[model samples]
Target: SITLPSHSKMLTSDFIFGVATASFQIEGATTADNRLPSIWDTFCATPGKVKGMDNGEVACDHYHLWEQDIQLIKDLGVDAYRLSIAWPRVMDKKGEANQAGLDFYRNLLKKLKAEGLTVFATLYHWDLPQHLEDKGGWLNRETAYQFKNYADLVTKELSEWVDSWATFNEPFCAAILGYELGIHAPGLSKPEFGRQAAHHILLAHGLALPVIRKNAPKSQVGIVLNMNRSYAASEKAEDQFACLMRETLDNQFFIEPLMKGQYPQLLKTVAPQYLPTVLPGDMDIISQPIDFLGMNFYTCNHNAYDADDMFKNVKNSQTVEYTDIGWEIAPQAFTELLVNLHKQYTLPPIYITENGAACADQIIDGEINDEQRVRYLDGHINAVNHAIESGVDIRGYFAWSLMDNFEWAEGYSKRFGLTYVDYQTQERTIKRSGHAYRTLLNNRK
Candidate 1:
């Protein structure tokens, strides 16, 4: 059994509980209210890019149905609401900020605040504006400067209402998947450029930090990194080395810089071709101090060395339990990873900004009985308790989603929601995991 900290001394109950959702993933009605095309908009339009050719053009229609979302938050008994603001919806170009876009977010903030929920706003959540992508995206230094300006605009407008703000979310994906694998938006399969994009995204975060700090002086500003721990397929030296390289790329590549003020030298040794792309003073910007660090972890990966393969020469070598999307299940590794991070770097108060499973959910007899998802949450929450007991200063935990909506590239095929949505009729139903979470929160001692 996982151990917990003392109830009287530690943050046992006043822990900020919450559910998180992204704008593009949940808020459909893509073209309404002067919103333009995001990289996702174009990515979804490309044939065979998303599963089933599913798009968020009319997702949950949250643009027209936020009240329903607010009601769901209230019903969950959570004190915080973590949401993302789409960059394309707010900023038109280099110097333009859309009023309609500002109004939509302002109204949402007002309603959430009125409902007594603490609001956490993420500035960029993988929805780079199309215009920005055209100008070389994160690979271009110009886009980094543009991001600072965009952060300034949003902070200036929303600072009075939002107390917590994040500069970017899962920037590794913004760097690798988008640029390296061509699997995500602004698709470009260029490994060298992917390395450059990674540095630039971190540079953007550093550049935006002071801008947000200047405008939203009282607000807590940070960045969210999605990380997964890696295990070796076996105790063999080659497998261990492969796991080390994979973990460095996926997890430590960002954290080491953000927390310790430098990139891992192993990164360059692992991929020497990326060395020339690393520019001077970029490390300083990537290491800017922040109020918090948000970590989004789900499952762990097992890796093995591939001597013949060219790209990093690492491969997934073991398959364990998996989610609906085949992501391996390893909740205990979540605790191990968090503790490992604390041991490696002096971190600020951290938040498990995103953690949840996508399970094969089915509605049976007027109820969504998602037992696998419940088990997933229980194990992870126990992991959190264990981490806290081990001296990690964790502040909060937010599930990956509040409801079923567009699942990004996967679309609505994979269900990661505590609340189930019948995409056919847009009906919302709280799943068994939702009730379990409510009960856990209410009964926590």
Candidate 2:
């Protein structure tokens, strides 16, 4: 059994446990129920954007199989289920409510609540409507207002079934990866585009928060952030500077604006031109107090100063194990990330919203043995326990996903699920880690 230490707070009812999945990553009915096209749909249609030319068109077929999927989740006995609402699915091009799309989630959420599973719904998970992208997407300030409209509509319809609401998932990846690095949907590569898009995304989040709260009065409202601890390659001053700047850009850039109501000061001189244009009172709007903060931690990075890029990630020459996705397996960094964030901000109750590993999986004789994932989960769960012991007010933990669906860019090649999916037959097989997670949760007092 991948059991926790006796004194672990997670063993008590005060801490919640769940599994998370995104709309674009799991729900495949791309055109079902009159759903409009999304940025991901456009991105996948373009050749070479996804591995194996795979798209989410039939991802796990969750759209049709959601009833059985809910049974699977119920069988796992998790206290909560974290899922996202597809903006394009529920709202039309005219900013009008789509009843069929709304009914889908309404039925799903109704079933989830009936099964006694608390629902944590996210408003945006990078599945921006293609129509929005047609008119500049997140790069346009008006899109922030559009998101508020969406938040207003969605929360009004389904808030009764949702216990928690997150305005956006990982703004950094949405802005930097999508706009600047061209690694994600609505891909464009330019330094100026990234920060500008980020500002609007944050603005969208802030604009949506009050509306979400007003509609979902009983639910907790917040946003999810992905972070990695930055370590210097050496004790050299430049390496140290590189480490700080790396943390500033990746971790603090988003957190500072939300928690402190201002951008990090380091960005002024280091990357001034890349800084986003902020109007008066934008910070005040961006920093609206929230009920909780969701932190998603996976791995850590090593950095060194670079003349052109300001800071560059240096390869770690030391021996270290990596996940199937090539992320360094560093459970200690998870604890460090939580404790450090705890020290830096005047905090809220935190949740490990998404944390898990992708492993090379195989089904042999009707059994999928994912021992590496089990070990990874065990180590990381203990890491979270350590953070709790060190005085971080963490309220819950949700595994990265419930099943293997579409992994963006890597496509279906990278499996981050506790359950295995047979694409041909649409069969579901629980891996060894799934059993371990269930055992751990069931054994809890």
Candidate 3:
């Protein structure tokens, strides 16, 4: 049912709607037309790196089938698309630009603009060039300079069409998982290097800010952080200190430098081995002003300290509902995290850039029914509304994905999309959550 406004013919709402995707996750044809191997290419080739040994060599074939995907965006009635461009595809070596790669994105931007959708582009989404990794990736200061040059190239070419730009996606994962835990690309197992990588990635963001603004003057620039609100395991003093250290390392490690222009004091106490890596004028370069902050939240953890652990011991101690992917489901904590973030720093407008759940999906009778996903989204949306009512300036929300695609490491085993994709046949089918979102949008009208 549709109702007309009493005085006008337009519908209104307090927030905007959008969908999101990353280049390497959906676009296949990984080695087409002068494109080189990214760190993900090497990562997937290593035995037991990805589940089922899956890779994104031909994922969704979005590079060639983008028109159909853009049509899907139009059909869903979304106002914007938050997408990432593959850096390895566009940059030849770490600092060299590839013309063929640049042309591909130009055409994609042209198509997106013609489709009447606002485009939010993220420069780096975990696809570092293998050549860059060979030179120590984010752990080396040269990689930060190379990132600035790459940013200059992207904005110079696509500035006309892109209105928003993100420097990096989830540097915490880049630091902790890739460098410390050996779980992601360019895998290493040095906790000290992980701490160093964290500082350098923030240094890259600060160095790249002016280049983004110089080229894309009208574009709003920000970084996407994946944070978890931390709690203590018990009432012990050691556990309380452990909780503070976990939150500082996992959340404030990046936010404090960006918003407050300094590193958290806990960084010196908890990971003192990294103190030597902090260079002269590093903090100033890591604290550039930006238009907004982008948050990608999923779960929170309870932490406790251990005396004998080499790596600062912060164990997950809380028990809560979890998704099929084993991520905790705590929607109220999402609202609480946002409100607390504003309380700590000089607040900026926020965007819920990525938020969704992964669940086991099955097709039956030519249709996919995922009621659990709908319920997950309902709870999260209510959390967003709660944050708004509490005076947090959140402007928009983008569902984590539009269709099921390749998830890093987990591969395609976990599905996190409103629509289901049959990987074997490349067929797309709308799920229950898709219809639920459509109905909710119609009601808001």
Candidate 4:
């Protein structure tokens, strides 16, 4: 049912182009509107945690500057705006709705609609109600049920206005990064806790997708997953097997369950002790059918065969260059990733939910050039176009961030936005890359 002009093929008229941001990284009125603390708040308070010990308490102040940001998004001529709703902002400590927080987003949605833009809403993006974390968080399945109630409360209010819904943004980050790596909020690094938390998050998605659907019947429902294809460092069978197993662990760990209603058997055999036991009906619930898949791809890994540190980083050839955040620039891998995902699973339509790079910004006389980001965007977007032409069922693509804001434990050290933001002045300036993006979108045809 999708059609395009004879000239346009990769990014058809129906293909959506958008930008994405999270509440914690943008909405900084932490104490305003009855917004209580999230696990991130607690995590930032811990001494020696978070690079430079930075926190989102004052990030972008989007809670107040949201109107300006939305205007910026509109100026970009994007068709959609992908953003997250803060659980801490919308729900109070007593497990009650915060009308002010809900009103804030409701008003934003109205503005986006006025601008003829689509709304891509993510229910949770690594921010848990601090109170819930205090009660064992995702380590306790109770948190999954808590998300259900939370999702129902929020969706019922915005169902009419929002066009698409994502139950959780990057479950691996919420569970593995936060729980297993101790890098994100409510930091804990126990494999047991991670296994439990990961399962609970998917369970929450299973329960919430239906709730989102019933409330927003016209809205498309999906989950955003982070993926970086892994390849063998060498052609050795050991290296090859290591790469495949790691792929199963990192990517398929969530994909198989969501797509096929079963965890990949390879994963269970390889990491039996690492994974939690599956209860009856869990897989059935985890595989709930939805509208689309949000794939957040950054880079690929060349993994070695080792029991520990499987993805040991080795010096690459001179041809391979890395981004400011040390992620290799691999647009070819992205094309392969999309084409491969299309073939590997009975995939629903796909959206590049999050894809962008962090680069050091060079500003002169109040104007930021950001040339590196321009190339990164151009290359990756071209990769997406290539994937589409190769028969990948890609429907849309959203840049990783609308603007540079707080970037988790790395603090504000990384700049990943096409637009440049002054942290202190709260000034939003469209960089050259942003202008380029606007130009490209305007000519999407």
Q: What's the TM-score of every candidate structure?
A: 0.94, 0.99, 0.93, 0.96
Q: Which ten residues in a row have the lowest lDDT in candidate 3?
A: 1-10
lDDT of each: 0.83, 0.92, 0.82, 0.85
RMSD of each: 2.4, 0.9, 3.2, 2.7
What order do candidates take by lDDT, descending? 2, 4, 1, 3
Clashing pairs in 1: none
Write model 1 residue lDDT over 143-227, tens digit each, in one string: 8888888898999999988979999999889889999889888889877888788888888899898889989888898999998
The TM-score obtained by model 4 is 0.96
Off by over 4 Å in 1: 1-13, 310-320
Candidate 4 lDDT by residue in tens digits, 193-212: 87778899999999887888
* Tens digit of per-residue lDDT, candidate 2, span 306-415: 98886888777699999999999999999998999899888989999999999999999999889999999999999999999999999999998899989998999999
TM-score of candidate 1 versus the correct structure, residues matched by position: 0.94
Clashing pairs in 2: none
Off by over 4 Å in 2: none
Encode model 3's per-residue lDDT on 133-232: one tens digit a residue.
8878888889999888889888998999997899999998988789988998888977788878888899999999999999989889999998877778
Error of 1 at 238 (Å): 1.1
